[PDB]
DNA sequence: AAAAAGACTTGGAAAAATTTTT
DNA sequence: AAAAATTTTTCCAAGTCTTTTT
């Protein structure tokens, strides 16, 4: 029988668990060497590469078809990192990447892909059965009286970094994660997981103030990557329920907050004027609270608080509309945001004052960062941060649009059209793009449907119109939103 | 403070598995 | 059979906000 964690007494703040036991992470499949017939060339002559160098060479060979393997930054980074993985004998022969011929390696990898879909019933069924025994042995964990699923237990294989957009580190080598890089987290009364034969873990800790099971440091950015519980668990779902509850508490406080920031545009001090114009953008246009990145780590992308002077172009009268602000920046994942939006009279006058005596490279809202904006938002409502406005706007627009687009006389397949049409409006507001059915050509429903929309709004909609939840939510989503699907009436109001 | 770390939050695109069209 | 159009898993990062160092 399935566990209804939502009927339980809410888990206390501070300590995340009392008990934790798991079988550790599943390491990336080992490197299968190149056979004798698959040769590498340098200056037209054959050259057998050492195992370490040959492994790095394969990553490039597999990506050879893409246009990014011809870029300055990619090639510079790849070659620099391939030098480290070479022997002193190889370092003296291989001076540049351009005299290297990977074409034969590339052909073998295409040949293996063509040979992988031609497998028998003893190969196609066997590998899918060894994946199932792996899913049941390492894909589950015990955390406080119950067996819950683990998210991504299979650690990512080594390769070359690409990232999203115009990334400075594209082409850098993602190293193979070893047991000696793993920090295991579990309880003192639990059976500490066994490392692969011949190896030992980096650390075995017992921190109950955190929710992760396994952690390590990746080399590209230096940040800690984690292995946590799947979305269907108590620890993730309760936090997901609390996120929506916070957005619901902002609903009965928004009119009071909107009136306050409208008055703040007139204030004597500029520290308050900028804070209010930035909050106006976050409320109206659902922008992300733009944190400050370190120059040269990730692609140059901004958000609301990190907006520069060059990202906006002021127009008093354009297209027959008053006070137009033309936004043109790259948001998260290098997705372009473009909107010609008519603002209030005081907001336009304020933006003119913020763009004065400044160069294009300078920050628009100086004397303001994400911490100052969130410190103020905490003084208005408890637990309020800038991303709560995005959750609020997305969820309320779905509720509003579902009421507006669903009609009583329509059939079940036609009602699904209306749900997806309401979901479309949420994706346009949140700027969730999908690169090139005529409507949803450039729009992506996935991100909002799972991160942004209180699932109870959908469960309420479904029980009202007689649409079974399986027509809206698939197998995996139904498990993530189980709390909502069980506990929720037709009368749910955000 | 205020930089740096740490711990959460937020798929779409490319491939492979099928299914349908020629 | 053989190819094309769909469906569906496999591949791969980047923000937000909190907590620690410097
Ligand atoms: C595409 C879309 C995005 O980007 C946004 O929007 O933001 C995303 C999402 C949504 O929300 C999600 O969810 N996700 C998850 C994940 C991702 N990415 C990635 C990359 C890489 C890797 O490796 C991974 C895995 N790990 C293990 C965690 C991932 C995941 C995203 C995105």
CA torsion sign for A256, A262, A266, A267 is positive
Domains of chain A: 1-31+120-230 (2.170.11.10), 32-119 (1.10.10.41), 231-385 (3.90.15.10), 386-494 (1.10.132.10)
H/E run at residue A339: strand A336-342
CA triplet A46, A48, A49: central angle to 5 degrees? 130
The answer to whether A289 CB is within 7 Å of strand C is yes
Neighbours of A92 (CB within 10 A): 9
**Among residues A448, A469, A470, A466, which one has the least CA distance to residue A458?**
A469
> How is residue A395 written in tokens?
């969820």
For residue A368, the 8-state DSSP code is -
Resolution value, angstrom units = 2.6
Neighbours of A396 (CB within 10 A): 20
**Max CA separation in chain A (angstroms):** 78
How far is residue A377's CA from residue A488's CA, in Å, rounded to a whole number? 30
Q: How far is CA A261 from CA A246, A267, A342, A346, in A?
A: 20, 10, 18, 11
Question: Facing residues of A318 across strands?
Answer: A321
CA of A442 to C1' of B6 (A): 36
> How is residue A431 written in tokens?
């700027």
Which ligand 1 atom is the nearest neighbour of the CA of A152? Answer: 27
- What SS3 class is residue A253? coil
Beta strands in A81-234, from DSSP E residues, in sequence order = 100-101, 140-143, 146-149, 159-160, 173-174, 183-185, 203-205, 214-217, 224-227
**Among residues A396, A391, A285, which one has the least CA distance to residue A331?**
A285
Residue nearest to atom 2 of ligand 1 (CA): A447
How far is residue A332's CA from residue A406's CA, in Å, rounded to a whole number? 32
Annotated active-site residue A452? The verdict is: yes
- The nucleotide minimizing the C1' distance to residue A161's CA is C12
The answer to whether A443 touches A433, Cβ cutoff 8 Å, is yes
The answer to whether A13 CB is within 7 Å of strand B is no
- What SS3 class is residue A93? coil
Distance A447 CA to ligand 1 centre (A): 10
> How is residue A396 written in tokens?
């309320």
Q: Which residue approaches B8 most closely, CA to C1'?
A: A211
Residue nearest to atom 32 of ligand 1 (CA): A447
How far is residue A241's CA from residue A167's CA, in Å, rounded to a whole number? 35
The answer to whether A85 touches A160, Cβ cutoff 8 Å, is no
In A355-451, alpha helices (H):
370-380, 388-405, 412-429, 446-447
Choose one of A28, A150, A152, A164 to mutate for the ligand 1 pocket test, by most ligand atoms within 8 angstroms of C-beta. A152
The answer to whether A371 touches A465, Cβ cutoff 8 Å, is no
Question: Facing residues of A321 across strands?
Answer: A318
Query: Residues 6 or more apart from A306 whose CB is under 8 A from it?
Result: A290, A291, A292, A293, A363
């Amino acid at each position: 029988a399935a566990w209804k964690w939502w009927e339980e007494e809410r888990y206390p703040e501070g300590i995340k668990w009392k008990f934790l036991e798991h079988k550790g992470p599943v390491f990336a499949p080992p490197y299968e060497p190149l056979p004798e017939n698959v040769k590498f060339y340098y200056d037209g002559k054959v050259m057998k590469l050492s195992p370490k160098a040959e492994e790095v060479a394969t990553f490039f060979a597999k990506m050879l078809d893409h246009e990014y393997t011809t870029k300055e930054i990619f090639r510079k980074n790849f070659f620099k990192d391939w030098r480290k993985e070479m022997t002193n004998e190889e370092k003296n022969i291989i001076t540049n990447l351009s005299k290297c011929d990977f074409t034969q390696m590339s052909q073998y990898f295409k040949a293996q892909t063509e040979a992988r879909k031609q497998m028998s019933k003893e190969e196609k069924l066997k590998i899918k059965e060894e994946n199932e025994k792996l899913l049941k042995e390492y894909g589950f964990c015990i955390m406080d009286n119950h067996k819950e699923r683990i998210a991504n237990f299979k650690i990512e294989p080594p390769g070359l970094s690409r990232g999203r957009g115009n990334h400075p580190k594209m082409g850098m080598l993602k190293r193979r994660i070893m047991p000696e890089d793993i920090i295991i987290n579990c309880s003192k009364d639990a059976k500490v997981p066994s490392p692969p034969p011949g190896h030992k873990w980096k650390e075995v800790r017992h921190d109950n103030k955190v929710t992760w099971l396994v952690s390590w440091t990746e080399n590209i950015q230096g940040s800690i990557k984690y292995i946590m519980l799947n979305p269907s668990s108590r620890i993730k779902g309760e936090k997901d329920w609390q996120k929506y509850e916070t957005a619901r508490r902002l609903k009965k406080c928004v009119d009071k907050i909107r009136n306050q920031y409208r008055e703040d545009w007139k204030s004597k001090e500029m520290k308050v004027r900028q804070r209010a114009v930035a909050l106006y953008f976050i409320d109206k246009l659902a922008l992300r609270a733009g944190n400050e990145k370190e120059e040269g780590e990730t692609a140059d992308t901004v958000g609301c608080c990190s907006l520069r002077v060059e990202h906006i172009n002021l127009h008093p009268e354009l297209d027959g509309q008053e006070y137009v602000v033309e936004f043109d920046f790259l948001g998260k994942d290098s997705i372009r945001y473009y909107n010609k939006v008519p603002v209030e009279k005081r907001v336009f006058k304020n933006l003119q004052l913020f763009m004065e005596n400044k160069q294009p490279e300078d920050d628009l809202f100086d004397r303001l960062n994400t911490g100052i904006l969130n410190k103020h938002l905490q003084d208005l409502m408890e637990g309020l941060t800038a991303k709560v406005f995005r959750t609020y706007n997305a969820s309320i627009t779905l509720q509003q649009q579902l009421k507006e687009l669903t009609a009583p006389d329509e059939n079940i397949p036609a009602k699904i059209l209306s749900y997806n049409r309401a979901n479309r409006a949420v994706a346009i507001l949140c700027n969730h793009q999908q690169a090139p059915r005529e409507e949803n050509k450039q729009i992506a429903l996935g991100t909002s449907k799972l991160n942004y929309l209180d699932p109870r709004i959908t469960v309420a909609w479904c029980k009202k119109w007689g649409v079974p939840i399986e027509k809206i939510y698939n197998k995996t989503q139904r498990e993530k939103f189980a709390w909502a699907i069980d506990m929720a009436d037709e009368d749910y109001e955000f």
